[PDB]
Amino acid sequence: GPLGSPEFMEGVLYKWTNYLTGWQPRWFVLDNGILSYYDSQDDVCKGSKGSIKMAVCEIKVHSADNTRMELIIPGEQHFYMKAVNAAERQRWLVALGSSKASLTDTRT
């Protein structure tokens, strides 16, 4: 994953809401082992209202290189994330996937 270059990642992901609404892009940034969500980029500066703690949350990454990844945090969870394309997904995989590999606390 992150090698030498600063381990920072930012962008949006597909988030499922309802069948009527379809899909809604939401803003996510990976920093310091925490994956935080915001309403927009400007909203980031206001201060996070909520975040996903990667050290306690699994980013589900297997092998198939494509946009589909899953975030599971026991209690809240049910976060499905999908990038623009598999390449974009790989960017998230660089920051997030490194967290998966030998992560803390009781997993699975």
Side-chain angles (χ1 to χ4, degrees):
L3 183 63
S5 206
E7 319 152 285
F8 293 99
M9 179 58 185
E10 63 188 313
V12 324
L13 282 309
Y14 144 84
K15 178 66 199 308
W16 179 263
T17 44
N18 187 271
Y19 53 92
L20 295 172
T21 44
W23 88 279
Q24 304 192 331
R26 193 56 52 163
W27 191 265
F28 296 91
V29 305
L30 191 287
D31 77 277
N32 295 325
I34 306 305
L35 194 283
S36 49
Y37 52 90
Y38 301 90
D39 188 83
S40 294
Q41 188 180 151
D42 176 60
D43 180 61
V44 179
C45 297
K46 323 308 199 193
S48 53
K49 276 66 201 293
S51 308
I52 300 176
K53 174 180 193 169
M54 293 304 298
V56 75
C57 309
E58 287 193 59
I59 164 67
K60 315 300 285 187
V61 173
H62 201 280
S63 311
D65 294 291
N66 175 269
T67 62
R68 35 94 67 237
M69 315 97 74
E70 171 174 281
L71 265 289
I72 158 67
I73 154 54
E76 307 183 66
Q77 69 203 33
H78 199 247
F79 287 100
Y80 200 72
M81 291 167 71
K82 175 169 295 182
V84 181
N85 57 31
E88 288 292 278
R89 158 271 199 180
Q90 181 58 30
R91 297 170 67 184
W92 288 103
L93 253 65
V94 168
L96 302 166
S98 191
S99 185
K100 201 206 62 171
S102 307
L103 191 49
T104 40
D105 208 272
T106 27
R107 294 183 50 212
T108 52

